[PDB]
Amino acid sequence: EPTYTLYATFDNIGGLKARSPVSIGGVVVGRVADITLDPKTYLPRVTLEIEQRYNHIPDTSSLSIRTSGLLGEQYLALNVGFEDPELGTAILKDGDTIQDTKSAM
Amino acid sequence: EPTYTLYATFDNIGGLKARSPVSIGGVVVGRVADITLDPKTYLPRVTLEIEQRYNHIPDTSSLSIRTSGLLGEQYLALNVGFEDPELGTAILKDGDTIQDTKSAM
Amino acid sequence: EPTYTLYATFDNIGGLKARSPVSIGGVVVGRVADITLDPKTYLPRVTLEIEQRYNHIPDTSSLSIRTSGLLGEQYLALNVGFEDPELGTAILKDGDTIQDTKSAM
Amino acid sequence: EPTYTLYATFDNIGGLKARSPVSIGGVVVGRVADITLDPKTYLPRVTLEIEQRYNHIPDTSSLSIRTSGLLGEQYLALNVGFEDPELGTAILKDGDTIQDTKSAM
Amino acid sequence: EPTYTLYATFDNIGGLKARSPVSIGGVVVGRVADITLDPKTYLPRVTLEIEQRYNHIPDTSSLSIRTSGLLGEQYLALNVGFEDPELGTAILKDGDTIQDTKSAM
Amino acid sequence: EPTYTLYATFDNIGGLKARSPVSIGGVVVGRVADITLDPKTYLPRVTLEIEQRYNHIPDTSSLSIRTSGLLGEQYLALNVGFEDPELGTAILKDGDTIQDTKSAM
Numbered sequence: 001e002p003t004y005t006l007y008a009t010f011d012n013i014g015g016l017k018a019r020s021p022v023s024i025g026g027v028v029v030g031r032v033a034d035i036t037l038d039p040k041t042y043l044p045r046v047t048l049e050i051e052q053r054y055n056h057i058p059d060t061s062s063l064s065i066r067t068s069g070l071l072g073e074q075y076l077a078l079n080v081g082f083e084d085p086e087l088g089t090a091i092l093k094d095g096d097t098i099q100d101t102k103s104a105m
Numbered sequence: 106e107p108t109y110t111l112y113a114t115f116d117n118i119g120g121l122k123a124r125s126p127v128s129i130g131g132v133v134v135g136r137v138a139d140i141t142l143d144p145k146t147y148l149p150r151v152t153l154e155i156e157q158r159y160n161h162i163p164d165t166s167s168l169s170i171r172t173s174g175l176l177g178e179q180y181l182a183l184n185v186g187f188e189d190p191e192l193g194t195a196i197l198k199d200g201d202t203i204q205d206t207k208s209a210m
Numbered sequence: 211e212p213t214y215t216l217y218a219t220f221d222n223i224g225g226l227k228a229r230s231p232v233s234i235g236g237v238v239v240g241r242v243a244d245i246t247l248d249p250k251t252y253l254p255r256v257t258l259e260i261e262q263r264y265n266h267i268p269d270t271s272s273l274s275i276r277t278s279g280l281l282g283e284q285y286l287a288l289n290v291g292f293e294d295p296e297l298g299t300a301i302l303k304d305g306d307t308i309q310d311t312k313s314a315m
Numbered sequence: 316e317p318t319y320t321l322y323a324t325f326d327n328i329g330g331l332k333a334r335s336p337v338s339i340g341g342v343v344v345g346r347v348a349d350i351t352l353d354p355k356t357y358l359p360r361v362t363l364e365i366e367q368r369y370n371h372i373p374d375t376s377s378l379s380i381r382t383s384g385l386l387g388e389q390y391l392a393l394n395v396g397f398e399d400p401e402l403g404t405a406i407l408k409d410g411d412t413i414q415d416t417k418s419a420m
Numbered sequence: 421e422p423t424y425t426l427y428a429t430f431d432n433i434g435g436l437k438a439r440s441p442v443s444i445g446g447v448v449v450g451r452v453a454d455i456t457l458d459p460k461t462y463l464p465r466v467t468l469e470i471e472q473r474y475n476h477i478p479d480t481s482s483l484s485i486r487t488s489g490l491l492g493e494q495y496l497a498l499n500v501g502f503e504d505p506e507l508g509t510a511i512l513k514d515g516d517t518i519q520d521t522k523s524a525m
Numbered sequence: 526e527p528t529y530t531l532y533a534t535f536d537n538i539g540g541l542k543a544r545s546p547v548s549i550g551g552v553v554v555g556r557v558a559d560i561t562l563d564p565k566t567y568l569p570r571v572t573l574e575i576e577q578r579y580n581h582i583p584d585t586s587s588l589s590i591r592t593s594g595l596l597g598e599q600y601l602a603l604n605v606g607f608e609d610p611e612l613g614t615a616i617l618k619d620g621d622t623i624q625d626t627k628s629a630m
Contacts, residue, residue: 013551015593025149026118026209027142037552039578042605044550053144068120070176071595080147104551130254131223131314132247159247173225176281185252235359236328236419237352263354278330280386290357340464341433341524342457368459383435385491395462445569446538446629447562474562488540491596500567 002052003030004094008063008076013044014104015074016065022048022076029054029078048076050092058083059090062100074104108135108154109199113168113181118149119209120179121170127153127181134159134183153181155197162197163188167205179209213240213259214304218273223254224314225284226275232258232286239264242286258286260302267302268293272310284314317367318345319409323378323391328359329419330389331380337363337391344369344393363391365407373398374405377415389419423450423469424514428483428496433464434524435494436485442468442496449474449498468496470512477512478503482520494524528555528574529619533588538569539629540599541590547573547601554579557601573601575617582617583608587625599629 013035022030030050037044050057060081067074081100083089092098118140127135135155142149155162165186172179186205188194197203223245232240240260248255260267270291277284291310293300302308328350337345345365352359365372375396382389396415398404407413433455442450450470457464470477480501487494501520503509512518538560547555555575563570575582585606592599606625608615617623 011550015597016551024142024147025116026121027140027149029142035552037549037554037579039581042549042579042582044552054142054147056144057147067594069172072120129247129252130221131226132245132254134247158249159252161249162252174277174281177225234352234357235326236331237350237359239352264352264357266354267357279382282330339457339462340431341436342455342464344457369457369462371459372462384487387435444562444567445536446541447560447569449562473564474567476564477567489592489596492540 003049004052004055005033006048006050006092006096006098008046008048008098008101009043010046010065010101010103011043012065012103013046014065016046016076016104017074020073020075022050022063022078024054024078024080030076032076046076055091057081057092059092059096059098060100061092061098062102063098064102065104107157109157109160109197110138111153111155111197111201111203113151113153113203113206114143114146114148115151115168115170115206115208116148117170117208118151119170121151121181121209122179125178125180127155127168127183129159129183129185137181151181160196161194162186164195164197164201164203165205166197166203167207168203169207170209212262214262214265214302215243216258216260216302216306216308218256218258218308218311219248219251220254220256220275220311220313222275222313222315223256223284224275226256226286226314227284230283230285232260232273232288234264234288234290239288256286260288265301267291269300269302269306269308270310271302271308272312273308274312275314318364319367319370320348321363321365321407321411321413323361323363323413323416324358325361325380325416325418326358327380327418328361329380331361331391331419332389335388335390337365337378337393339369339393339395345391347391361391370406372396372407374407374411374413375415376407376413377417378413379417380419422472424472424475424512425453426468426470426512426516426518428466428468428518428521429458429461429463430466430483430485430521430523431463432485432523433466434485436466436496436524437494440493440495442470442483442498444474444498444500452496466496475511476509477501479510479512479516479518480520481512481518482522483518484522485524527577529577529580529617530558531573531575531617531621531623533571533573533623533626534563534566535569535571535590535626535628537590537628537630538571538599539590541571541601541629542599545598545600547575547588547603549579549603549605554603571601575603580616582606584615584617584621584623585625586617586623587627588623589627590629 034047058081139152244257349362373396454467559572
C-alpha cells in the first residue's frame, strides 16, 4: 500500500500511540507512524502515513482525537474540509501539515 | 439462508464492521458484507446481505447505526418504511440502494 | 414441569433472546421460547412458556422488556393486570396473546 | 446462631434470592430463607431468619431491596423504626410480618 | 508497623469490611479491624488500627465512607481537624473515639 | 535513562500510586517515584522522576491528577506554564517543588 506523510501538532494526544488508526467517516485510511514531544515547544507532533488512494483532502481538513465507544481505543478522525475551488484548491500532499487539530477532551 | 444485496451510504459508520448484524426491532434479518470509503465522495458505502425471506421491504425504509446497551457492539437498525397502497408496491430488490440512512451517535 | 404458551408483539425486543426469563415481581414463572419477525407486520413476535401453576393471570396483564441492574441480562416482566370482576373470568390460556406490551427504548 | 422468622410481602423482589443477606446500617443480621410467589395474589413473599440477639426491632421498621455499589448483589436493608413507648411498644417477634416494604427500583 | 486503636460509630457502613483502608488525602494510614452492630443502639461501631507514626491527629478529626472511582472498594477518609493553638493539644490516642463521622453515599 | 526529581503537595492523590506516569500533552516524560504523608501538614507529598531531556520546564508549570478514559489508570498531567521572559530563566531543576497542583475530586 503506497503512503504519503502528513504531520499534525496537538496540545494533548491523550492515549494515542504509534499505529493508532486514522479514519474518515469511521473507515481506516492511515496510521500514526511516530509521536514525539518537541523538547523546545513541549507540543506533541504526530507523523501520519495516509494511503495514497485517499489523495484529494483539502488542507482546511481537521484532525480529532476520538475514542471507540465509551471504553475502546483512541484514534484520529480526519474531517474532510471545504475549499471553494474558484479561490484556489490547496490539497494535502506528501510532507504537508494539517493546521486544524482538536486534542483529547 | 439465501440473501439479496443492498447498498447504503453513511457520513460515518462508527465501529460498524464486516459481519455486524442488520436488525428489524432487534431481530437479525442480515449482515454487513463489506465497507468501502469511496475516494470520490469520502463517504462510506456499506454492502448488506438481507435474508431472502424478508423480501417485501419498502424502498422508503431507512437504516440507523445503533449500539447494543451502553457498552456493546454497533449494528444497523432497518426501519420499515410506509408503503402507499394507492400507488403500488415499490420494494427493495437485489442490488438496490437504501437512500435514507442515519450515521453513528 | 408443564408449561402453557402465550404470544406477544413488540416494536423492539432489544437484547432479549430465546431462554430469557419471564418474571412476576422478580420471580421466574417462565421463559422466552422463540423470537421471529412477523412477515405481515415486520414486527417481532415472541413466544413465551409459562409454568402451569401460574394459571389465573388476567388477560389485562402486560409484558415489559427490562434489564437486571445496569449492564445485566434482558428479561420480560409480566405485570398482573386489574380485572373488573363484573366482566370476570378473562384468564390467559395456552395459545392466548398478551395485547399490552412495552419495548426496549 | 439462634434465629427467629419474619415474613415480608413485596410487589417486586428484583434479583433477591435464597440466602441474600438482611442488614441494619450495612451489618448482616439475617438471611432470606425462602421466596415464594403466592399463586392467588401474585405477590412475592419473603421468609427471613434474623439472629436472636437483634431482638428489639419496632414493628414500624421497614425493609428495602438495595444493591451493593452500582453492579453488586441485591440485599434487604432493615430500617429500624420509631414507636413512642408511652403509646405501646410493639416489637417484631418470631413469626411476625413487616408491613412496610419497598421493592426493587 | 505498630498501631493504636480508634473507634467510630456510623449510621450505615455500606460495603466497608475488615481490612478496608483508612486514608488521609488518599494515603493509607491504617485499617478497619472489626465492625460490630451494637444491639442497644442498632448503630454500627468500627474499630480502626492507625499506624503509630500518624500520632498527632486532633480529636476534632472526622471520618467519611468513600468509594475508589465509580466501581471500586469502600474506604474511610480521615479528615484532619483544626487544632486551636490558643487552647493546647487535644490529640487522638489508643482507645479514643472519633465523634465526627459521615455514613455511606 | 537519566532523570531529575521534583516534589509536589496535593490535598488528595486519589488512586495515584508509585510508577503512575507523568505526561506532557499525553506523552510520558516521567514517573511517580514515591507518595507519603508529610508529618507537618498531614498532606500527601509526591516525588516525581522526570527524564533529563525534558529540562526547560518553567517553574510556573502545574500538575493535575487525571484518569485514562472513564475507568482507567490515574496519572499526573504536567501543564507547561507561561513565563514572563522579563523575569525569565526560572526553570525546574533536580530537587525543586511544583507549587501549582490540582487534586482528585
